């Protein structure tokens, strides 16, 4: 569910 | 398929200390099977980092302690309401690789306005209660 990301991008 | 555990994070004075939160705040280190397993942590941005998520609250799960090898795990984030039930759950459909100091999560986790709405009942006593569910595979 929903788009996953990271905070290093 | 190896170890599945959970952690509940209650953030007191969400609106009252909004200025004191800052850009990012991180929860206390949590881990189950402490003698066997490795330390985790939860990071949240009250306001988004960029213009795409500036109206959203971003939530991430980060690995703190250096593992012996690469760690792959799924995670499920939800918000506990006034009655302690899961709401607005958001889970990664697949697992992701974790190394020391690496985080994974959702930039648009919940709309910041939907959170502050009195009708949703998400902030009782000005407390945002989050629930994380990790499923480590190895």
Residue numbers in the entry:
A (entry chain C): 196 to 204
B (entry chain A): 28 to 165
Please quote the paper that reports this structure:
Proteins bound by SPOP usually harbor a SPOP-binding consensus sequence (SBC, Φ-π-S-S/T-S/T where Φ is a nonpolar residue and π is a polar residue). The C-terminal segment 199VSSST203 is the only putative SBC motif in Geminin. We also determined the X-ray crystal structure of SPOP-MATH domain in complex with the Geminin peptide 195AEGTVSSSTDAKPCI209 to a resolution of 3.4 Å. There are two copies of SPOP-Geminin complex in the asymmetric unit. The Geminin peptide electron density is detectable for each complex, within which we could fit nine Geminin residues from Glu196 to Asp204. Consistent with our NMR data, the peptide lies in a shallow groove across SPOP surface. The binding mode in SPOP-Geminin is similar to those in crystal structures of SPOP complexed with other peptides. Geminin Val199 sits in a hydrophobic pocket formed by SPOP Phe102, Tyr123, Trp131, and Phe133, while Geminin Ser200, Ser201, and Ser202 probably participate in a network of intermolecular hydrogen bonds with SPOP residues Lys129, Asp130, Gly132, and Lys134. The Geminin 199VSSST203 motif contributes 8 out of 9 putative intermolecular hydrogen bonds between SPOP and Geminin. In contrast, there were almost no changes in the 1H-15N HSQC spectrum of SPOP MATH upon addition of Geminin SBC-alanine mutant peptide, demonstrating that the SBC motif 199VSSST203 is essential for SPOP-Geminin interaction.
The SPOP gene encodes a substrate-binding adaptor subunit of the CULLIN3 (CUL3)-RING box 1 (RBX1) E3 ubiquitin ligase (CRL) complex. Geminin and its binding partner Cdt1 are essential for the regulation of DNA replication. Here we show that the CULLIN3 E3 ubiquitin ligase adaptor protein SPOP binds Geminin at endogenous level and regulates DNA replication. SPOP promotes K27-linked non-degradative poly-ubiquitination of Geminin at lysine residues 100 and 127.
